[PDB]
Design a protein around this ligand. Structure first.
Ligand SMILES: CN(C)C[C@H](O)COc1ccc(Nc2cc(Nc3c(F)cccc3F)ncn2)cc1
Length: 278
């Protein structure tokens, strides 16, 4: 660590600082998290390189402590959304960001690597119009937000799939469009019930096997499903169609990142440059 000079606290899996490499002069994001199985899993992530994945530069395991050195980006999506709350992020930019994130997920998923905790706070953007996934697969290696958690996780599924990331991204997509969180639960049951109140309480018809999930209770209230025209206006039909497929209850019916990239919604995708105030 003597090789790094902290500049400021970027945020809080451990604290993260903006730091400078005393030798190279490189500015990076330093995350202070040591078990062995962890060292191995982390080492694998160092090879998981993609333009839409925040690059893990180095893994420093010294003094029985673990430090992760990441490429540095100046802003996260949460901050950009708050900064664009009065006017809303332009649809072309929303589409560009969604498309890029799906490319990133398609890559990770093709390597059987899941993110597991996607949220606006770990989606980083730069002046070039790029957006990148941060904190990827470290979940396998303050109050935690439940807003983007897939229903199968909330219902006790222990061996969930890549589908959980598609669900989280769908929630973020809706949030960019409406400028309000889709399912802002403040407890596990509030989160589950908010989802049920919007998409309808799941049953064996739409989700075979749901009534046998660990935390499923026959006593769950039965709410009717709401129309997406009401959930995310003024998203057009292509966008609503895609969102509906990203929010399918059955993880096996939920659209994959690869298939989502071919959805008609992206027929006119472009790469606009955002207006960033750094
Ligand atoms: C309260 N508010 C004023 C603070 C700012 O919004 C904070 O603004 C920010 C937000 C993000 C960055 N850049 C990062 C973060 C990161 N890792 C990383 C992450 F992105 C999320 C969680 C864990 C991580 F390790 N890796 C690389 N570059 C800088 C400044």
């Amino acid at each position: 660590m003597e090789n790094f000079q902290k500049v400021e606290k970027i945020g809080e899996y451990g604290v993260v600082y903006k730091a400078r490499n005393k030798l190279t002069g490189e500015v990076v994001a330093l995350k202070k998290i040591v078990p062995s199985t962890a060292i191995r899993e982390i080492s694998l992530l160092k090879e998981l390189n993609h333009p839409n994945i925040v690059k893990l530069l180095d893994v420093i395991h010294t003094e029985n402590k673990l430090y992760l050195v990441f490429e540095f980006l100046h802003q996260d999506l949460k901050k950009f959304m708050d900064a664009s709350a009065l006017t809303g992020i332009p649809l072309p930019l929303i589409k560009s960001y969604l498309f890029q994130l799906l490319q990133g997920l398609a890559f990770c998923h093709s390597h059987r690597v899941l993110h597991r905790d996607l949220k606006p706070q770990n989606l980083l953007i730069n002046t070039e119009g790029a957006i990148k996934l941060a904190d990827f697969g470290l979940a396998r290696a303050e109050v935690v937000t439940l807003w983007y958690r897939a229903p199968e996780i909330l219902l006790g599924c222990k061996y969930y799939s890549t589908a959980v990331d598609i669900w989280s991204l769908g929630c973020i997509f809706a949030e960019m469009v409406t400028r309000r969180a889709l399912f802002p639960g403040d407890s596990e049951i509030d989160q589950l019930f908010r989802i049920f109140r919007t998409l309808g309480t799941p049953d064996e018809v739409v989700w075979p096997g749901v009534t046998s999930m660990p935390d499923y209770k026959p006593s769950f209230p039965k709410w009717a499903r709401q129309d997406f025209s009401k959930v995310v206006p003024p998203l057009d039909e292509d966008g609503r169609s895609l969102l509906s497929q990203m929010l399918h209850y059955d993880p096996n019916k939920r659209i994959s990142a690869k298939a989502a990239l071919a959805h008609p919604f992206f027929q006119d995708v472009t790469k606009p440059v955002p207006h960033l105030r750094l």
